[PDB]
Design an enzyme around this catalytic site. Structure first.
Site, PDB file in Angstrom:
ATOM      1  N   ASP A  36      -3.139  -0.907   8.281  1.00 16.61           N
ATOM      2  CA  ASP A  36      -2.168   0.089   8.753  1.00 16.61           C
ATOM      3  C   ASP A  36      -1.561  -0.417  10.061  1.00 16.61           C
ATOM      4  O   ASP A  36      -2.108  -1.329  10.694  1.00 16.61           O
ATOM      5  CB  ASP A  36      -2.849   1.432   9.054  1.00 16.61           C
ATOM      6  CG  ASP A  36      -3.209   2.214   7.805  1.00 16.61           C
ATOM      7  OD1 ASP A  36      -3.180   3.464   7.885  1.00 16.61           O
ATOM      8  OD2 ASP A  36      -3.530   1.598   6.757  1.00 16.61           O
ATOM      9  N   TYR A  89      -5.122   5.265  -3.025  1.00 17.31           N
ATOM     10  CA  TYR A  89      -3.877   6.042  -2.953  1.00 17.31           C
ATOM     11  C   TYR A  89      -3.160   5.971  -4.288  1.00 17.31           C
ATOM     12  O   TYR A  89      -3.257   4.964  -5.000  1.00 17.31           O
ATOM     13  CB  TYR A  89      -2.972   5.540  -1.822  1.00 17.31           C
ATOM     14  CG  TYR A  89      -3.328   6.137  -0.471  1.00 17.31           C
ATOM     15  CD1 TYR A  89      -4.647   6.149  -0.021  1.00 17.31           C
ATOM     16  CD2 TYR A  89      -2.352   6.677   0.356  1.00 17.31           C
ATOM     17  CE1 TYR A  89      -4.985   6.691   1.222  1.00 17.31           C
ATOM     18  CE2 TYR A  89      -2.673   7.215   1.602  1.00 17.31           C
ATOM     19  CZ  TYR A  89      -3.994   7.217   2.027  1.00 17.31           C
ATOM     20  OH  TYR A  89      -4.322   7.754   3.259  1.00 17.31           O
ATOM     21  N   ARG A 122     -13.743   4.660  -2.702  1.00 18.70           N
ATOM     22  CA  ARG A 122     -12.464   4.910  -3.373  1.00 18.70           C
ATOM     23  C   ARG A 122     -12.493   4.189  -4.714  1.00 18.70           C
ATOM     24  O   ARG A 122     -12.037   3.038  -4.856  1.00 18.70           O
ATOM     25  CB  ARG A 122     -11.286   4.441  -2.504  1.00 18.70           C
ATOM     26  CG  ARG A 122     -11.169   5.230  -1.188  1.00 18.70           C
ATOM     27  CD  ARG A 122      -9.925   4.863  -0.372  1.00 18.70           C
ATOM     28  NE  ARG A 122      -9.612   5.887   0.641  1.00 18.70           N
ATOM     29  CZ  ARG A 122      -8.764   5.703   1.653  1.00 18.70           C
ATOM     30  NH1 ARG A 122      -8.137   4.540   1.796  1.00 18.70           N
ATOM     31  NH2 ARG A 122      -8.542   6.683   2.525  1.00 18.70           N
ATOM     32  N   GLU A 124      -3.664  14.599   4.276  1.00 18.45           N
ATOM     33  CA  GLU A 124      -2.541  14.221   3.416  1.00 18.45           C
ATOM     34  C   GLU A 124      -2.409  15.227   2.277  1.00 18.45           C
ATOM     35  O   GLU A 124      -3.345  15.416   1.488  1.00 18.45           O
ATOM     36  CB  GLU A 124      -2.740  12.793   2.889  1.00 18.45           C
ATOM     37  CG  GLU A 124      -2.462  11.734   3.967  1.00 18.45           C
ATOM     38  CD  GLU A 124      -3.144  10.406   3.699  1.00 18.45           C
ATOM     39  OE1 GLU A 124      -2.750   9.399   4.333  1.00 18.45           O
ATOM     40  OE2 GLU A 124      -4.080  10.348   2.865  1.00 18.45           O
ATOM     41  N   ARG A 161      -6.123  16.362   1.300  1.00 18.25           N
ATOM     42  CA  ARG A 161      -7.309  15.605   1.695  1.00 18.25           C
ATOM     43  C   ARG A 161      -7.987  16.285   2.871  1.00 18.25           C
ATOM     44  O   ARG A 161      -7.311  16.870   3.721  1.00 18.25           O
ATOM     45  CB  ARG A 161      -6.844  14.208   2.115  1.00 18.25           C
ATOM     46  CG  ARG A 161      -7.881  13.288   2.721  1.00 18.25           C
ATOM     47  CD  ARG A 161      -7.223  11.947   3.031  1.00 18.25           C
ATOM     48  NE  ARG A 161      -8.085  11.072   3.818  1.00 18.25           N
ATOM     49  CZ  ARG A 161      -7.769   9.824   4.143  1.00 18.25           C
ATOM     50  NH1 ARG A 161      -6.608   9.308   3.742  1.00 18.25           N
ATOM     51  NH2 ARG A 161      -8.604   9.096   4.866  1.00 18.25           N
ATOM     52  N   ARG A 194       0.857  -1.166   0.000  1.00 22.73           N
ATOM     53  CA  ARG A 194       0.000   0.000   0.000  1.00 22.73           C
ATOM     54  C   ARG A 194       0.899   1.224   0.000  1.00 22.73           C
ATOM     55  O   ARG A 194       2.101   1.125   0.302  1.00 22.73           O
ATOM     56  CB  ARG A 194      -0.898   0.011   1.245  1.00 22.73           C
ATOM     57  CG  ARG A 194      -2.217  -0.785   1.137  1.00 22.73           C
ATOM     58  CD  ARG A 194      -3.340  -0.116   2.014  1.00 22.73           C
ATOM     59  NE  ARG A 194      -3.620   1.257   1.586  1.00 22.73           N
ATOM     60  CZ  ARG A 194      -4.377   2.125   2.258  1.00 22.73           C
ATOM     61  NH1 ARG A 194      -4.966   1.771   3.401  1.00 22.73           N
ATOM     62  NH2 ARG A 194      -4.563   3.350   1.777  1.00 22.73           N
TER      63      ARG A 194
HETATM   64  N1  LIG Z   1      -2.230   6.916   5.622  1.00 21.55           N
HETATM   65  C1  LIG Z   1      -3.009   6.786   6.827  1.00 21.55           C
HETATM   66  C2  LIG Z   1      -4.461   6.636   6.484  1.00 21.55           C
HETATM   67  C3  LIG Z   1      -4.656   5.458   5.581  1.00 21.55           C
HETATM   68  S1  LIG Z   1      -6.376   5.232   5.227  1.00 21.55           S
HETATM   69  O1  LIG Z   1      -6.990   6.520   4.855  1.00 21.55           O
HETATM   70  O2  LIG Z   1      -7.027   4.668   6.408  1.00 21.55           O
HETATM   71  O3  LIG Z   1      -6.492   4.295   4.091  1.00 21.55           O
END
Ligand SMILES: NCCCS(=O)(=O)O
Length: 658
Positions: A232, A615, A581, A503, A519, A207
Site C-alpha cells: 500500500d 479483495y 485470506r 470497508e 469489514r 491490487r
Molecule cells: N485498503 C487498505 C487496507 C488494505 S489491507 O487490508 O492492508 O490489505
C-alpha cells in the site's frame, strides 16, 4: 521438438509411481524441460508431483523434485550433497484446485537452462519464478540418480512427500524450450487476466479490483496498478481501467484513470527475500483504493480514489489536518512554498495561488492537472526512477522533465502531507478519463480525509442519487450526490469501532432501502440499513455463518436482478476463514420481505478452503452471469508479497452457485 518421454493418466493416491526404466536412460545433456498437466483438489500439506533422486543409503539430500503445498504454493528443489548445492525455488499462490466443483487441470512448465544457468517455472501460462545461479546444477546430473518418481521422492528407499492428486499428462524434453515455445503450449485455465504484468500500465503488480456493469452493457473494471511491489502507499500506484463489451470474454488494453508522473512507470521485479521485501518507494505520489459508479442522468461514469502526496501513505499521513483552509464556509487547498516552514498559500478559484500572509494573489496558478504555472508558463521537475543495482532500493533522477505537480516531492509548492479523495469522470464509458478533481473535506478543517471504500458506489434505481461509502474512525461516512457528482454531502453512520478498516459496500434491497455490508475488527462481517436512500442509518448487526480474520477483508456485494427460489437475492463475495485470506466464497442470500432479514442459503466455494482469496469485485453481467475479479492470494501475508498475475477473473452462472 519431440519429447524424450511422454506419459499420462497417472493417479496419485498416496502411493508413488516408478517410471525410472521409462525415463532415466532417456535423459541426456544438461538442459531439460518438464511439461506437466495435473489436478490436485485434495492435496496433502506438502507433496511432490515429480522426483528424480538417488535412492541409496547416505544420499538422502541428492534429488530434484517438483513440489506443491496445500496453500497453492509451487516450487522445486535441486540438491546434490557432493556438490554442496541445495537449491529451493518456489512461489506461493501459483495453483488452482477446483472450479465450479470440478478439479482444475493445472499446466506446469519447468525449464532448466544450462546455457543461461537459469531455472524458470510457469504455471497456467504465468511465470511464477525465474532464477539465475552462479553454479548451475542440471537436474539429472545429480550424483547417483537412480530413480524417477511420480507422486513422491524416493529417499533411502522410502516414499517422501507422498502426493494425492493426478498427473493427466507429463512430458520431458532434452532442451530448454524458449519463452515463445512455452507460449504455444495449450492451457486449461478456469480464469482469465484483465490486468497483467507487461501490459500498457507497465506495473508488475495489481491490487484492489473493482467491477461495474454499465447501462450500455459494457462491463468496466478499475484497479490499483502498483509499481513498487504490492505494498500500500507510500509507493507508486496509479489507477487503471479496462472494459469488456462481450460479457467479460475479452477486455481492452488498460488505460489510466488517475496517474502521477513524478516517478517513471517501471515494470520492476520486487525482491521477495526477508532482508529487502519491505523496500518501499518512498518519494512518489500515488493513488490507491478506487470505486466506480454510473450516473443515469448525465450518462457519465464516475470514479473516485484516495490520493497520496509524495512519500505519503496511511502510516504517516498527517491526521487532524484536512489539507484545506476554510474561509467563509468555502474550502481552499493549502500550499507550502520552497523555503517556508508553514503553509502560507492557498489555491482559489481559477487556480490562482494566493498568499495568505499578505492576502494577495501571486504570479502562480494551478492548472486543471494540479500542475504549477508561473505567468502561464509550465514549471517542470525531473522524474525519478528506481533500481536495486546497489543491492538495495535507490530512487534517483532519470534526466526526464515532467510538469511540476503540487503532489510531487520536488515541487515549488507542496500540498499538506495527508490523504485526500479525488474524483474523475468519463463521458465515453471508460475510453478516456478527465483530469481528477479533489473532493472537499466533509468532517472539518482539522480532520483528515475519510478513506474511500473500494469497489462500487451505489446508483439508486428510482432517483438520481449517487452514493460512495467511505470510512474514518468511529463511523461510515457516506458521500451523497444528487447532481451527477457536481456537489457532495456526507451522511455519518456511527459504528462501534475505533480504528477499523471499515470497508463497506452497498446493495439496494428495494427502492430507497440500502443495506451496507462492511469489514470490522470482530471476525464477522457487519451490516446496517437505510430506508430513506441514505439519509439515516440503522444500528449495526453482524452476519453469522461467515468468518473473517481479526483484521478483516473487503467484502463485495450486489443485488441480483433475478429472483432465486422465488425470492429477492443478494450475493456476497468474501474469504470465509478465521485464519487468513483464503477460502473464497460467493454467498447467496434470499431476502425475507416481511422484515428485510436475509437468509444466507447457498455458499459457493470459489476454490479450496486453503487457497488464497482476498479483495474481490463482483458484478451481474448483462447476460445474468456473475463476473468475479479477485486477488487470488493472501494479500495480508508477509510471505505472499510481490506476486505477479494473482488478480484474476472468472465467469459463473447462478446454477453453479446453487
Ligand atoms: N485498503 C487498505 C487496507 C488494505 S489491507 O487490508 O492492508 O490489505
Amino acid at each position: 521438438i519431440s519429447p524424450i518421454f511422454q506419459g499420462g493418466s497417472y493417479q496419485l493416491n498416496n502411493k508413488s509411481i516408478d517410471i525410472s526404466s521409462l525415463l532415466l536412460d532417456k535423459l541426456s545433456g544438461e538442459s531439460q524441460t518438464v511439461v506437466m498437466k495435473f489436478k490436485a483438489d485434495k492435496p496433502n500439506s506438502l507433496q511432490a508431483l515429480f522426483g528424480l533422486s538417488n535412492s541409496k543409503a547416505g544420499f538422502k539430500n541428492n534429488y530434484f523434485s517438483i513440489f506443491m503445498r496445500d496453500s497453492g504454493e509451487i516450487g522445486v528443489e535441486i540438491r546434490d550433497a557432493q556438490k554442496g548445492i541445495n537449491y529451493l525455488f518456489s512461489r506461493p499462490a501459483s495453483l488452482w484446485g477446483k472450479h465450479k466443483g470440478q478439479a482444475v487441470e493445472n499446466t506446469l512448465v519447468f525449464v532448466s537452462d544450462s546455457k543461461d544457468k537459469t531455472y524458470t517455472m510457469y504455471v497456467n501460462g504465468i511465470e511464477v519464478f525465474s532464477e539465475t545461479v552462479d553454479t548451475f546444477l542440471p537436474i539429472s546430473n545429480i550424483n547417483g540418480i537412480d530413480k524417477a518418481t511420480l507422486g513422491a521422492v524416493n529417499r533411502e528407499g522410502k516414499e517422501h512427500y507422498l502426493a494425492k492428486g493426478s498427473i493427466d499428462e507429463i512430458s520431458l524434453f532434452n532442451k530448454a524450450i524458449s519463452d515463445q515455445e512455452v507460449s504455444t503450449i495449450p492451457l486449461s485455465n478456469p480464469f482469465q487476466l484483465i490486468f497483467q504484468s507487461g501490459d500498457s500500465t507497465q506495473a508488475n503488480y495489481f491490487r484492489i479490483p473493482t467491477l461495474y456493469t454499465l447501462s450500455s452493457g459494457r462491463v468496466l473494471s478499475s484497479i490499483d496498478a502498483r509499481y513498487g511491489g504490492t505494498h500500500d502507499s507510500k509507493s507508486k500506484i496509479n489507477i487503471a481501467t479496462s472494459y469488456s463489451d462481450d460479457n467479460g470474454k475479452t477486455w481492452s488494453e488498460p488505460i489510466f484513470a488517475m496517474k502521477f508522473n513524478d516517478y517513471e512507470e517501471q515494470l520492476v521485479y520486487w525482491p521477495r527475500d526477508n532482508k529487502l521485501k519491505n523496500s518501499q518507494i518512498s518519494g512518489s505520489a500515488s493513488f490507491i483504493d478506487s470505486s466506480i459508479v454510473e450516473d443515469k442522468k448525465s450518462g457519465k461514469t464516475i470514479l473516485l480514489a484516495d490520493v497520496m502526496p509524495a512519500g505519503i501513505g496511511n502510516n504517516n499521513a498527517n491526521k487532524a489536518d484536512s489539507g484545506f483552509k476554510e474561509i467563509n464556509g468555502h474550502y481552499y487547498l493549502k500550499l507550502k512554498k520552497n523555503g517556508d516552514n508553514d503553509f502560507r498559500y492557498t489555491v482559489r478559484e481559477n487556480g490562482v495561488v494566493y498568499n495568505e500572509t499578505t492576502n494577495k494573489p501571486t504570479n502562480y496558478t494551478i492548472n486543471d492537472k494540479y500542475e504549477v504555472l508561473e505567468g502561464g508558463k509550465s514549471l517542470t521537475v525531473e522524474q525519478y526512477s528506481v533500481d536495486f543495482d546497489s543491492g538495495s532500493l535507490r530512487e534517483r533522477h532519470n534526466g526526464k522533465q515532467v510538469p511540476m505537480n503540487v503532489f510531487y516531492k520536488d515541487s515549488l509548492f507542496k500540498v499538506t502531507p495527508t490523504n485526500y479523495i479525488a474524483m474523475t469522470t468519463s463521458q465515453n464509458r471508460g475510453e478516456s478519463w478527465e483530469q481528477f478533481k479533489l473532493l472537499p473535506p466533509f468532517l472539518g478543517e482539522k480532520h483528515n480525509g475519510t478513506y474511500l471504500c473500494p469497489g462500487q458506489g451505489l446508483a439508486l434505481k428510482s432517483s438520481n442519487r449517487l452514493i460512495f461509502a467511505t470510512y474514518t474512525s468511529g463511523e461510515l461516512t457516506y458521500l451523497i450526490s444528487d447532481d451527477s457528482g457536481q456537489t457532495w454531502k456526507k451522511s455519518s453512520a456511527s459504528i462501534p469501532f475505533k480504528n477499523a478498516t471499515a470497508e463497506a459496500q452497498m446493495v439496494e434491497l428495494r427502492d430507497g432501502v440500502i443495506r451496507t455490508f462492511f469489514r470490522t475488527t470482530t471476525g464477522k462481517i457487519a451490516y446496517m440499513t437505510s430506508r430513506d436512500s441514505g439519509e439515516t442509518w440503522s444500528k449495526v448487526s453482524y452476519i453469522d455463518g461467515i468468518q473473517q480474520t481479526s483484521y478483516g477483508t473487503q467484502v463485495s456485494a450486489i443485488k441480483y436482478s433475478q429472483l432465486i427460489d422465488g425470492k429477492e437475492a443478494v450475493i456476497l463475495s468474501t474469504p470465509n476463514s478465521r485464519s487468513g485470506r483464503k477460502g473464497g466464497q460467493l454467498v447467496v442470500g434470499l431476502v425475507n420481505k416481511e422484515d428485510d432479514s436475509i437468509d444466507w442459503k447457498y455458499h459457493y466455494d470459489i476454490d479450496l478452503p486453503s487457497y488464497g482469496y482476498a479483495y474481490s469485485a463482483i458484478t451481474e453481467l448483462p447476460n445474468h452471469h456473475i463476473g468475479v475479479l479477485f486477488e487470488k492470494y493472501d494479500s495480508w501475508s508477509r510471505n505472499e508479497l510481490h506476486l505477479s498475475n494473482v488478480v484474476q477473473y472468472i465467469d459463473l452462472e447462478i446454477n453453479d452457485l446453487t
